[PDB]
Design a protein around this ligand. Structure first.
Ligand SMILES: Cc1cc2nc3c(=O)[nH]c(=O)nc-3n(C[C@H](O)[C@H](O)[C@H](O)COP(=O)(O)OP(=O)(O)OC[C@H]3O[C@@H](n4cnc5c(N)ncnc54)[C@H](O)[C@@H]3O)c2cc1C
Ligand SMILES: Cc1cc2nc3c(=O)[nH]c(=O)nc-3n(C[C@H](O)[C@H](O)[C@H](O)COP(=O)(O)OP(=O)(O)OC[C@H]3O[C@@H](n4cnc5c(N)ncnc54)[C@H](O)[C@@H]3O)c2cc1C
Ligand SMILES: CCCCCCCCC[C@@H](O)CC(=O)O
Ligand SMILES: CCCCCCCCC[C@@H](O)CC(=O)O
Lengths: 622, 622
């Protein structure tokens, strides 16, 4: 172990193992996860060349190979627990996306909005991988506005079939993972038309590739959508249907149905968001792990000229770049847990609203934070050897899919304005919005005072958004136009509300921490996260007379003091995440700190060094 | 042309051609650039498959091919003007990095710190490409701190040769473009040791590959450093020398020399930074061009339910995401020009300080801004078809190389503290720091008032940094330790100073604009950039009693009003940058707005669609 990394771990004031137990939910979960990880790590069937050393085509291929093997082994091992399944999948794919993602996450599950008959006709085959499926929702012309989807499913009463059609180039399904080259079946969301009337979006099981040959069936045009910022191993695809016929019985009819004669009948998410909040926390933590360990190993420049080059971790600016993000990572981990907890327990509107907002809030912050970690590593951060570019590229789509962040913040804003209007009418509201009862609209030393500051800041920005929205409605009449004209203020209000919630949830968790040394360090992170947010948006607190200019300067001074107090625990705090080297996929972030020797080897193992002379020399230079 | 893009261009209140003339420096420059671009565009020798559709190895190869051809043609065409050379190179490489970058940018130029004898011995051959060279400075263990470089050059008086050696793994040169596989010669920066004494860093011409075979010479270990976040076509490399001997005459001896007997003798940047500021402005402008055009073409969701889906450009949040960045792009273009202007004209310390700061300030802002543009495009922004991921990946290293940004900001801070101390002593200072004479430490309606606000904010943060630094020196004695402990405050002071300079330079440029319609629109951008910066850091202005909370809210309201006022000119303002489609490398940002049809084709032309069935199907799914 690098002596520089050993001294950092020796200075730690707490036992990281205890934090790992908390993150996993219990000591037994930690044990189970580590064992499943070990199970995959030492299995030859899941090993291969570094993804960065393979072409995109080869990445997709190894992905397909591991995913197929993945399903087989979990079945052989009798792994059914959703939690274990996740650990298993994560370990097998080293954090990278995989082509059976929609097959296992949407295809099979959805078949469980289907009838019995259908379930026993498409499930079993799909479960055994005799069939490979995906879910095709998004179209080239529509992602956010589902009402605008153009794909149609027109019933033909003469043959009792649905005619699936992509009338325009924009109607082509676009983005579905596993749709490109992996699946021979796709559940397509289309506008159902029967008896000359449209009844909205419905789901249809659409066979798309021939069994045995995997050849696109007649009337089907399908393929990969091309290279992207990341997601190399994912065959995100497109699907164009030329009045392609399928049986009536291919329509998922659990909720709504269409009779043989064509009569339409009946009818008689928070989960994916909670996961995305966890994903944001985890990716940011991986990034922080790499940058902080590297910062402890990397020595450069100087403080005292008469002293040897110090670890860059010694620099206050370096600490300012990373510790606040380290604190953010922990804050989000607990925020994610709070979400799962709350969801597992009239409070639904509140749940949907908050979950939409937190999903956007956390993914945006983790997004920027990951790149800050990459840059804090200097030049070596740019090489894939740092492992951070892959983490960023793999994570960033989270701000776009499962509800575009800005749209999600506006959804949260609609809820806040509703509550604002209720209070304005004389009603007493509850939940995390209780503070709105104190409208119209502290101690920087305590977490209770800091939480109260965030509460008041949220109340103030909600009031500003409501007032401006009202002004626009009054002068322009249309509430829809008014909404757009105050949308920037509204999103800011949603952001402030979510920020308050994260601070409160993080603060509320501290008292529950059993080990004192653990509680103390996590308290410092909570304090740093809170103070940091105030410093970053000081204007919000000053404009609302929430804190004085003097307190703001105190906040800034206190943030710097916390950095030195956190420094001794920096490395142990990232070790606590318990990421394996294979999971970080980073030479700079290796647990043992032996960076340089391993970096040299990594480079020599890379593709362009297959030969000493590149073919281009003989053709254009010689 | 897309009707949606045509209506935006029709609503413009100015002639974009006039802005293009300004950006190029004159109507004749615009004409010359467009003609050189046309010269390359229609030359078969420079055309090839989309870079995104090629493996990294093939990208490097086509890069080498075009670069070699590039040198030949510029020579055939008699292109010698540095400006034309730039246009030429940019057009040929479509904005992508190229392997002869250091050969032409450093190798040849440096040979012009050499003696005559040497110049006529390595130049001509290198000029004709008979030899390919690079400059190797950075080492695995040192990038920022050059004093710490480990490569040594030990003189051997017996054979009159220098012995180049890489004693450790960290001493290995690392990152030099063109070093990996392209060059057979490298100018190596090494610690010169002769007569038992070290005399610091000196430059040595080191042959590294055999002529004809390009095989690594005995004692030379060289190669590519592996895949990176970007820079696919650049063979950034490593170089390890095992006590490799070269003639004494290989030491660049223009400034310092070493006699045959081994006696050491004598001695008896702002430019690259100015370019990086322009690079930041240009990359951000490319990103803005793509996102704004796409926003005008992309229709989604709704404002009035009774209305058809509007262009997303209609959304205030979308305008808030892009217009401020559009204004930033223009601000930086003029900032870059100001730099070139100032440099072309006792003011050196001031120049070095400001240039270090602006380089960091602009590259950081353009960096974040480019990713904001990518995300504003929704899902399609993630595909390489948007062209933005390549722009970001290609640009981002600017924050790391040519002086790591944080280090550069601290250099600017050292200057500011020096001036602060001079004023404190009773001296009257000049230049952009004149405001410091007003220590110790407006009209939000006018640019003069806004500039003054930025001036006072800078004065206030400089004072805070100086005071805190002083407090630390007083209590801890060591100024070096004190400097580190106030480094976060110092960088903030440098940032505020540079921000003021950008605002002032942008504001000062307006009166010089000849065409009134052009001046008016650019005035709106200057106002937006200024107000936006105040809103983003409101706390700085409020804490210093520079503006009241009431003015801050006015600032925020005024920013929104400016968005609608800018909207009608949004598309024309990006058209003004005059980027060719091939340069943007974006389907979403095409000049004609015909996005969807071209996106479908692009996807079908991509690698994974070479065949309908991927090989992985037959091996792991069938
Ligand atoms: C790597 C990746 C994988 C994906 N995988 C899948 C998959 O498996 N299956 C699938 O079906 N989909 C998938 N998608 C697509 C995803 O579903 C869509 O990208 C998302 O739902 C909406 O993206 P969009 O481009 O359609 O957004 P658009 O809304 O068209 O554009 C986004 C822009 O418009 C703005 N905007 C839109 N509406 C509003 C409004 N009402 N008010 C204010 N601003 C607004 C946004 O804020 C933003 O700036 C994937 C995307 C990516 C990047
Ligand atoms: C794509 C690419 C191409 C390159 N091309 C070349 C090339 O052609 N030739 C070449 O020789 N080089 C090249 N380089 C390397 C470049 O020169 C170095 O990356 C740069 O000079 C310093 O990077 P570093 O990692 O050595 O930084 P380091 O300083 O080791 O680390 C940076 C981190 O340490 C912090 N830090 C360092 N010193 C201080 C201090 N005194 N105070 C406070 N914080 C500090 C930084 O703020 C940052 O967070 C390239 C780099 C990239 C990414
Ligand atoms: C992040 C894990 C989520 C499940 C994997 C698929 C991700 C894309 C899902 C798509 O439906 C999101 C959207 O509806 O925009
Ligand atoms: C951006 C264009 C600059 C010239 C091309 C080479 C870029 C890397 C140069 C390296 O010397 C920067 C550094 O000194 O860190």
């Amino acid at each position: 172990m690098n002596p520089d990394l050993r001294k950092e771990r020796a200075s730690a004031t707490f036992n990281p193992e205890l934090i790992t137990h908390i993150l996993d939910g219990s000591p037994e979960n930690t044990r189970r996860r580590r064992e499943i990880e070990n199970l995959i790590l030492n299995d030859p069937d899941f090993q291969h060349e570094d993804y960065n050393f393979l072409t995109r085509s080869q990445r997709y291929e190894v992905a397909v190979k591991k995913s197929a093997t993945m399903v087989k082994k979990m079945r052989e091992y009798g792994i059914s627990d959703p939690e274990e399944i996740m650990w298993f999948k994560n370990s097998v794919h080293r954090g990278h996306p995989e082509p059976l993602d929609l097959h296992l996450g949407m295809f099979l599950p959805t078949l469980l909005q289907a009838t019995a008959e259908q379930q026993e006709r498409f499930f079993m085959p799909a479960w055994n991988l005799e069939i490979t499926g995906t879910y095709a929702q998004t179209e080239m012309g529509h992602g956010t506005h589902l009402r605008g989807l153009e794909t149609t499913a027109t019933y033909d009463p003469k043959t009792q079939e649905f005619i699936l059609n992509s009338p325009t180039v924009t109607s082509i399904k676009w983005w579905p993972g596993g749709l490109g080259k992996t699946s021979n079946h796709a559940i397509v969301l289309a506008q159902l038309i029967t008896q000359g009337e449209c009844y909205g979006l419905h789901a249809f099981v659409v066979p798309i590739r021939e069994i045995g040959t995997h050849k696109p069936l007649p009337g089907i045009t399908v393929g990969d959508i091309g290279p992207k910022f990341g997601y190399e191993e994912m065959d995100n695809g497109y699907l164009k249907m030329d009045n392609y016929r399928i049986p009536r019985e291919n329509m998922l009819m659990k909720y709504a149905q269409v009779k043989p004669d064509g009569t339409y009948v009946k009818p008689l998410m928070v989960f994916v968001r909670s996961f995305l909040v966890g994903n944001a926390a985890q990716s940011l933590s991986k990034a922080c792990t790499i940058a902080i360990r590297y910062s402890a190993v990397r020595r450069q420049s100087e403080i005292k000229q008469s002293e040897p080059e110090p670890q860059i971790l010694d620099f206050q600016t370096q600490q300012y770049k990373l510790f606040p993000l380290l604190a953010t990572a922990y804050a989000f981990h607990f925020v994610g847990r709070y979400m799962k907890e709350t969801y597992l327990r009239s409070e639904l509107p509140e749940l949907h609203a908050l979950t939409a907002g937190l999903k956007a809030f956390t993914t945006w912050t983790a997004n920027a934070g990951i790149e800050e970690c990459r840059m804090a590593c200097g030049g070596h951060g740019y090489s894939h050897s740092s492992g951070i570019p892959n983490i960023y590229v793999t994570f960033t789509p989270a701000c776009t899919f499962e509800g575009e962040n800005t749209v999600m913040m506006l959804q949260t804003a609609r809820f806040l304005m509703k509550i604002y209007d209720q209070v304005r009418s004389g009603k007493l509201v509850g939940g995390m919005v209780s503070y709105l009862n104190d409208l119209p609209s502290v101690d920087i030393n305590s977490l209770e005072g800091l939480t109260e500051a965030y509460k008041l800041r949220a109340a103030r920005l909600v009031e500003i958004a409501a007032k401006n929205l009202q002004t626009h409605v009054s002068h322009r009449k249309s509430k829809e136009v008014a909404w757009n004209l105050t949308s920037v203020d509204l999103v800011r209000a949603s952001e402030a509300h979510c920020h308050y919630v994260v601070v409160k949830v993080f603060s509320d968790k501290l008292p529950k921490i059993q080990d004192k040394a653990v509680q103390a360090v996590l308290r410092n992170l909570c304090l740093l996260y809170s103070l940091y947010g105030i410093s970053q948006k000081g204007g919000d607190f000053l404009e609302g007379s929430i804190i004085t200019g003097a307190q703001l300067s105190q906040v800034n001074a206190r943030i710097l003091e916390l950095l030195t107090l956190i420094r001794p625990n920096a490395v142990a705090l990232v070790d606590a995440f318990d990421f394996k080297d294979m999971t970080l996929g980073s030479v700079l972030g290796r647990y043992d700190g032996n960076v340089y020797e391993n970096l040299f080897e990594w480079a020599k193992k890379s593709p362009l060094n297959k030969t000493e002379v590149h073919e281009s020399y003989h053709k254009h230079l010689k």
